[PDB]
Write a protein that binds this ligand. Structure first.
Ligand SMILES: OC[C@H]1O[C@@H](O[C@@H]2[C@@H](CO)O[C@](O)(CO)[C@H]2O)[C@H](O)[C@@H](O)[C@H]1O
Ligand SMILES: OC[C@H]1O[C@@H](O[C@@H]2[C@@H](CO)O[C@](O)(CO)[C@H]2O)[C@H](O)[C@@H](O)[C@H]1O
Ligand SMILES: OC[C@H]1O[C@@H](O[C@@H]2[C@@H](CO)O[C@](O)(CO)[C@H]2O)[C@H](O)[C@@H](O)[C@H]1O
Ligand SMILES: OC[C@H]1O[C@@H](O[C@@H]2[C@@H](CO)O[C@](O)(CO)[C@H]2O)[C@H](O)[C@@H](O)[C@H]1O
Ligand SMILES: OC[C@H]1O[C@@H](O[C@@H]2[C@@H](CO)O[C@](O)(CO)[C@H]2O)[C@H](O)[C@@H](O)[C@H]1O
Ligand SMILES: [Ca+2]
Ligand SMILES: [Ca+2]
Ligand SMILES: [Ca+2]
Ligand SMILES: [Ca+2]
Ligand SMILES: [Ca+2]
Ligand SMILES: [Mg+2]
Ligand SMILES: [Mg+2]
Lengths: 144, 144
């Protein structure tokens, strides 16, 4: 099982600030990760995986920090052997919980990298484009 | 010494998960380049996989080998010179059902087909966890 055979959650990963989709350039599901209009293509169907990786329905690829400091986040091959490294694993931090116009309860949280202990982040407090990691500072744009 | 390979783990053809093409050798001598091609019921497309990691072609009696010694480059059939670049493991981590990746012992790189569509030439590449790098052992006499 190279796939995520035990997903916690599957759907569009939206930013709490902008309500915009976390997106991979193109429709292949590989490339740079940045926000964008929700276009309903399978590359925007994000898999929150039980093993702690973040993937997508278009391609068996992992949300990967492009370095060791405050680096850009790309969608690239999952290192799966000998085991998934901590750099490609993520976790829920603090959680804001709200009800959208659909009348459905949503739960936005910080997405914290397990190697650097840093936060999934968009540039500034509302760019609204390029995504990477950063220090966790409770702004409503570090919530997804 | 009489060189032992250990058992005999598999004897069959290798059908590609992405394209359902068979791991093939050019011509029918069992010698030369290895590429993806239509499943033909010839002995040149049957391989024996041993405990020692060698994949031996049933027609030619020679090894599935990578160019040079690094374990990176084009794949073909070549003399079995007990080197680690002619040895492959089948890590359960990169399987999807009965379709599995072959990991080169010398370079930790996967047996791979060029492009994403599992139709071109066969070499080694970074294990990316994609269908075109996964092969099923098949025992039928099917042709296209
Ligand atoms: O900003 C990235 C966006 O890319 C779009 O895809 C573009 C297609 C249009 O056919 O061609 C490219 O130029 C590359 O071949 C892409 O930039 C996606 O539809 C958007 O979802 C978005 O990711
Ligand atoms: O990498 C972006 C990080 O830096 C800050 O955002 C930057 C500020 C600079 O004052 O303005 C931008 O140019 C956005 O228009 C960003 O480059 C934020 O404080 C950090 O949260 C983080 O996003
Ligand atoms: O996919 C490549 C194919 O190559 C053929 O290889 C031989 C070449 C070179 O002499 O020409 C033939 O005579 C054509 O039949 C072959 O002996 C194989 O037939 C195909 O199976 C395939 O490997
Ligand atoms: O062509 C497949 C074979 O490649 C040999 O390595 C060659 C060496 C010199 O022998 O230099 C190259 O031209 C480029 O690196 C290679 O083609 C291997 O020793 C053989 O095991 C075999 O893989
Ligand atoms: O070494 C082979 C690699 O091929 C990549 O695909 C390449 C793309 C972009 O150049 O187009 C080709 O020319 C089509 O055959 C390829 O050279 C694959 O994405 C890699 O997985 C790898 O197999
Ligand atoms: Ca897209
Ligand atoms: Ca920010
Ligand atoms: Ca052939
Ligand atoms: Ca070699
Ligand atoms: Ca490939
Ligand atoms: Mg990014
Ligand atoms: Mg080849």
């Amino acid at each position: 099982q190279v796939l995520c055979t035990n997903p916690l959650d599957i759907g569009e990963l939206r930013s709490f600030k902008s309500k915009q989709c976390v997106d991979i350039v193109g429709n292949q599901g590989s490339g740079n990760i940045a926000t964008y209009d929700c276009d309903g293509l399978s590359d925007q169907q994000i898999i929150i995986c039980g093993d702690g990786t973040i993937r997508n329905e278009a391609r068996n690829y992992c949300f990967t920090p492009d370095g060791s400091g405050n680096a850009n986040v790309m969608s690239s091959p999952c290192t799966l052997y000998p085991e998934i490294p901590s750099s490609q694993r993520w976790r829920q931090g603090r959680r804001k919980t709200f009800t959208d116009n659909g009348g459905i309860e949503q739960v936005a949280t910080e997405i914290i990298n397990l190697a650097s202990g840093k936060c999934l982040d968009i540039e500034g407090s509302d760019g609204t484009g390029d995504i990477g990691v950063y220090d966790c500072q409770n702004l409503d744009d570090q919530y997804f | 010494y009489v060189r032992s390979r250990g058992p005999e783990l598999f004897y069959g053809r290798l059908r590609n998960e992405k394209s359902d093409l068979c791991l093939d050798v050019e011509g029918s001598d069992g010698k030369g380049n290895v590429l993806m091609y239509s499943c033909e019921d010839n002995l040149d497309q049957w391989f024996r996989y041993y405990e020692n990691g060698e994949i031996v072609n049933a027609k030619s009696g020679m090894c599935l080998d990578v160019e040079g010694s690094d374990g990176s480059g084009n794949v073909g059939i070549y003399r079995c010179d007990d080197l680690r670049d002619q040895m492959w493991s089948r890590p359960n981590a990169y399987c999807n059902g009965d379709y599995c990746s072959f990991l080169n012992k010398e370079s930790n790189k996967c047996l791979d087909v060029s492009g994403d569509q599992g139709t071109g030439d066969v070499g080694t590449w970074q294990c990316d966890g994609l269908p075109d790098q996964r092969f099923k052992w098949v025992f039928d006499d099917w042709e296209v």
